[PDB]
Design a protein around this motif. Structure first.
Motif, PDB file in Angstrom:
ATOM      1  N   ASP E 124       0.720  -1.298  -0.049  1.00  0.00           N
ATOM      2  CA  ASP E 124       0.014  -0.154  -0.012  1.00  0.00           C
ATOM      3  C   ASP E 124       0.882   1.110  -0.200  1.00  0.00           C
ATOM      4  O   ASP E 124       1.608   1.439   1.130  1.00  0.00           O
ATOM      5  CB  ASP E 124      -0.778   0.084   1.406  1.00  0.00           C
ATOM      6  N   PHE E 125       0.993   1.888  -1.190  1.00  0.00           N
ATOM      7  CA  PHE E 125       1.756   3.235  -1.163  1.00  0.00           C
ATOM      8  C   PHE E 125       0.624   4.315  -0.860  1.00  0.00           C
ATOM      9  O   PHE E 125      -0.611   4.315  -1.644  1.00  0.00           O
ATOM     10  CB  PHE E 125       2.323   3.568  -2.712  1.00  0.00           C
TER      11      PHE E 125
ATOM     12  N   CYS F 110       1.971   4.531   4.497  1.00  0.00           N
ATOM     13  CA  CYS F 110       2.064   3.360   3.497  1.00  0.00           C
ATOM     14  C   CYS F 110       2.252   2.021   4.623  1.00  0.00           C
ATOM     15  O   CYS F 110       2.392   2.216   5.581  1.00  0.00           O
ATOM     16  CB  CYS F 110       3.621   3.440   2.924  1.00  0.00           C
ATOM     17  N   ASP F 124      -6.520   0.177  -2.942  1.00  0.00           N
ATOM     18  CA  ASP F 124      -5.708   1.091  -2.160  1.00  0.00           C
ATOM     19  C   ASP F 124      -6.453   2.058  -1.601  1.00  0.00           C
ATOM     20  O   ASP F 124      -6.828   3.028  -2.009  1.00  0.00           O
ATOM     21  CB  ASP F 124      -4.867   1.744  -3.165  1.00  0.00           C
ATOM     22  N   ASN F 152       5.162  10.833   4.053  1.00  0.00           N
ATOM     23  CA  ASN F 152       4.597   9.261   4.397  1.00  0.00           C
ATOM     24  C   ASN F 152       5.685   8.564   5.315  1.00  0.00           C
ATOM     25  O   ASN F 152       6.747   8.701   5.265  1.00  0.00           O
ATOM     26  CB  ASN F 152       4.732   8.604   2.846  1.00  0.00           C
ATOM     27  N   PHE F 154       6.007   4.686   6.571  1.00  0.00           N
ATOM     28  CA  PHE F 154       5.620   3.347   6.215  1.00  0.00           C
ATOM     29  C   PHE F 154       5.667   2.589   7.356  1.00  0.00           C
ATOM     30  O   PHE F 154       6.220   2.506   8.191  1.00  0.00           O
ATOM     31  CB  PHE F 154       6.976   2.751   5.264  1.00  0.00           C
TER      32      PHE F 154
END
Ligand SMILES: Nc1nc2c(ncn2COCCO)c(=O)[nH]1
Ligand SMILES: Nc1nc2c(ncn2COCCO)c(=O)[nH]1
Ligand SMILES: Nc1nc2c(ncn2COCCO)c(=O)[nH]1
Ligand SMILES: Nc1nc2c(ncn2COCCO)c(=O)[nH]1
Ligand SMILES: Nc1nc2c(ncn2COCCO)c(=O)[nH]1
Ligand SMILES: Nc1nc2c(ncn2COCCO)c(=O)[nH]1
Lengths: 237, 237, 237, 237, 237, 237
Positions: E124-125, F110, F124, F152, F154
């Motif tokens: 999942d970006f 992410c 997504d 972002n 992760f």
């Protein structure tokens, strides 16, 4: 009768041994079963019923691959009162310590098939054997002087895999044997409420190895079948 | 010899008809081929070679499911010089307008197998037939007075699908026939650079329908095989 | 009128040729159609209707990409009575034997899009053309002295691919050309019950070098369009 | 010391019992171990080492969830010489025949996590326990007069599941209990070459009603822990 | 010059506004810029450079869908020194309280496209806008006294979706508007090292087919363009 | 009281800061709040309510990993009227120019977890923070003269990842820090209708094992907590 088995309720025992090759099923009926009777010839998928030390047993081919064995095992369970399925097959080894002619007992079966994802809303279904059937097989083996390995099989959809690197991953995660059925059989067993085990004999090593004689192959095949048949008798106690 | 075919280069023709049932392969060799010779018995997967109006042809069972037919078709192509594979099988229908005994020609094959995703980096590989082989089959059919439908098959991994609703989706998107092989065969053909076609005969309707007689089934089976054999001859021109 | 086509029932023929570029739709109308009238200009997506040897025909751009061409083809099918779509486009080659200016006919189309998975419960839908449309195109090309290649296209979502390892995979599996639409169009056609075909000229060899031509290009482009229009006349009988 | 365990080689036994709750690790050390010393307190994840009938044993919390228990089990295996992990936890039942206070042994563990897919190239890894550890646990339970159920757990990422249709699927496929760790622990054990087992008591019946017990609960919890410790003694021979 | 843009390094500003419709790019160039010159018309995808209160600004259509706008945004970034992209589009609402003509600012973009999965190893970006660009648009809208919501867009591949139930899921998770580009633009900006934002105005409800006129639609279309241009001025300080 | 929190409606503020470590929740309660009372200790997951410059504020550990923090954040939202969650954690850097002790604000997250895919029909879902909470933290950091990056995170399931190559992908796409929670927290906030933000400080580089001391680490730990608390005050106006 079912679309692939021309037989009726009671023609099969509640336990069925299943090699992939139906000619091996005939060999099993001749060599180990008493009072044997042919119960299936549809598509040449020879099936037999007889007795082993008094115990009603059937043996029938399942053919290569998850989709083939999934048909037979399903029909057996839902239409012929079958409770236990023992696959008795061959497999390729990836671990250097696992040798040609070793007996491997698949407590679990990895797979690259999508069948269990279809069953299980695209999550990971751990395709497993029935535990008592595993222990029965380990004990039968020990009583016969054979030391079986217990662990994961990998049930491959493609014998000729374009993904060579996957064999290294199998090795890393401890896969004992590569075959084409266990995960499918364990999935059907869980879907329809019965019990299953896969026992395999290492017939290839996807690394070196050397090879074996026809007399040696026959001996270990016979050993595997003895293990399967004796495991059933332990199971009844 | 390959691990599933005890034979040598030249034992097979460059074209092989493949029904799922090896007993149907024997029937084909007896009924349509001249000067026939058995070329395979490994695992009871009977294979034959003879001639049809002078043209060297082989016929051999492939067994049920993508993984089984993927083995045989692969070994044929890479070790026996095989160029064309014609699957000649049965299928279930979902469309009300598609009737029992219709001849369906699979220009494409949908599937719920993962084999082509493994081949194709998890993208959509359109599993297709060779176009000339499709047209050859359509023309052979027309010359014999049979009007074949051309379209998508669906190659299922699970004959006993837990996903009933998928048959409505197949219907919506125009699937002519449900079988267990085409997408696998078309994938192997693309992997190893040969050509393939699947022709099926509708033997079931997963909706109503009525059923048929053994004489009717034999006639359409013979019609399908005539279509396959004559299509080969058109292909050579 | 639909949200993307400002026109009314009757303004389009029941067949629509579709390049990606609306400027090329005007090129086609002007060069090949008599009595050609513009029937759409919403978003600059020029559509035209006229006659080719007395047969009513439309031509309209679809834009680049599956999501664009899916809008136009759907609205044409459900609101304008269109029964056949013929995409007429360019593509990039990955095979050595496929040359600049080869005409390729997309019998099937692979893709890295998710649109067919969304339609087909995350299984593999084989996105295929209408068979009769494919053979009409092959025959129309043969009458003009052109030998069209028939096989798989790849419909890419990313023109500028993050990694080109996928081109080697396309090449291994026999992909004739890479474009951005066919799989989407074939999906819409199956969803909404119409017929479709993609014909492309090779504009580029992504493999090599890539040694070039003149224009020449433009005569091969005109041959593609003539194949399309003549295939429609064959389809009429 | 590792980033999550402030201890040194030797501070842990080569076997570690692991509840989710570090407060229950203290409960276990205090109740069942002699000469028990605290060996970790980083992040409040209490770990202890002592002896049970002369055998060096550790007990340490793992936190809730696959990602938490994967950290601790990995660091224990690669930095503290730990060879066996026994998770000792609670789980929720979905089957009617599975009762509150049944002891369930996770021979395998299904999951909706992606961790094993990440490890196993997006194929199905069957996350399984060590066979000998499973049978040591079954026998230790039989000696105490308890009939442990052996089968599949489901290791959930979401305690509060977005939709409970998955519980019906778990029930159809024979899942004995739902917890949040086993599949992760079995994955780490296979990744890093150690052995693991999950034993749970049923704390809840997600199906029904859910009629309740006393404590009682607490005696069944102590039986689980006694099964774990006694299984270690059996494993030693 | 790039394959889709006939222009040279310098013809575009370092900031480009992109509506999907090239004709709206034209209207924007006429209505808001001065000394506006056309810099692109390949495929009719009209692009214009001019000035807004003395600031060099470009504006160019991107076509419908992720693949279309990914082509143009990439080319602009790699070959014309464009630093910031602002999409100025329409969207559909799924939340009942998001009214027609509301301005929506896509801080994130959900998608059912596979493009970001292809970039991000099938994980999942989170497709996100540049935070400062988002802040600038919130402040530009405040200073002009315009209401504007910040949150998630959903970028769909299928305008005409076969899965109506997914709109309920988008609703459930707070999706402010459904369009066809943002997630693709944000992935391109991330891949090629530029900055991007998507602003949209709600031109219908997915649920309804609600009514407005050409007076209000353009005044709201103009509101969004004012926000975008003023937000750039703020970014410059 | 909920299954993991022994407390009642009113014991928590409407805003809760959550570090992973419950011991850091304790340090925060001691160092920053006044009239701090312990409101939770179930499983040792220490939670505290107090005041910051007269504002009622709570602070409670969430454990390591998506499943752990999803439990606690859900329960806080559904049963204790919590409106905003601010995670205050550590992360690993993958970008060479992101230095140890940098403050990172996760506007998006992410993930390689499957939790949001399970929520969002395998599409997504862009896991995003609340924009105003992000703005408040940027302004609180500005007013205190602290450097802070926005973009972002992760959220990884495996701290000890078997796929090192994925870190290169995270690097490629601008991931500011790797942690184990944010994407799960943002999914929970979306599902249950609350607001969330993740702030982290970079406590190491995935690549290196770089060195600091206990003076700087706490002063930077304190910087993040100041930002978080001051950002709440700004949110109140
Ligand atoms: N994939 C695979 N399957 C095997 C092997 N050995 C036995 N099986 C399973 O039997 C079916 C193939 O004959 C092997 O080496 N690889
Ligand atoms: N799944 C499926 N496969 C079929 C059907 N009919 C023929 N085949 C393919 O042949 C293999 C099963 O005998 C059918 O109705 N369903
Ligand atoms: N993805 C892709 N599309 C192409 C190629 N050649 C032509 N097309 C179709 O896109 C037309 C816009 O250039 C190619 O090589 N790759
Ligand atoms: N997912 C899930 N986990 C459980 C259940 N019962 C116990 N666990 C393990 O979580 C322990 C924290 O409550 C259950 O019913 N579902
Ligand atoms: N998918 C989708 N996109 C939209 C909608 N409204 C505007 N957009 C943005 O692109 C579509 C242009 O017609 C809609 O309702 N659905
Ligand atoms: N996955 C991961 N999480 C981290 C890292 N650094 C801090 N976090 C946040 O949670 C991990 C706590 O040890 C890291 O390097 N990797």
């Amino acid at each position: 009768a079912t679309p692939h088995i021309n037989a009726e309720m009671g023609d099969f025992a509640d336990v069925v041994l299943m090699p992939g090759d139906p000619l091996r099923a005939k060999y099993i009926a001749e060599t180990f079963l008493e009072d044997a009777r042919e119960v299936n010839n549809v598509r040449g998928m020879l099936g037999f019923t007889g007795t082993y030390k008094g115990r009603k047993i059937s043996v029938m081919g399942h053919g290569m691959g998850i989709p083939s064995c999934s048909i037979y095992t399903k029909e057996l369970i839902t239409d012929f009162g079958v409770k236990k399925i023992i696959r008795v097959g061959s497999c390729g080894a990836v671990l250097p310590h696992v040798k040609l002619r070793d007996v491997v007992i698949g407590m679990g079966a990895c797979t690259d098939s999508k069948v269990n994802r279809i069953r299980f809303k695209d999550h990971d279904f751990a395709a497993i054997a029935d535990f008592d059937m595993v222990r029965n097989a380990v004990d039968a083996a020990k009583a016969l002087g054979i030391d079986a390995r217990v662990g994961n099989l990998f049930s491959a959809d493609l014998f000729y895999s374009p993904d060579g690197e996957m064999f290294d991953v199998m090795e890393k995660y401890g896969i004992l044997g590569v075959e084409m059925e266990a995960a499918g059989i364990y999935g059907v067993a869980a879907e329809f409420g019965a019990k299953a085990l896969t026992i395999c004999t290492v017939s290839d090593h996807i690394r070196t190895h050397e090879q074996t004689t026809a007399a040696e192959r026959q001996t270990t095949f016979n050993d595997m079948i003895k293990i399967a048949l004796e495991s059933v008798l332990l199971g009844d106690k």
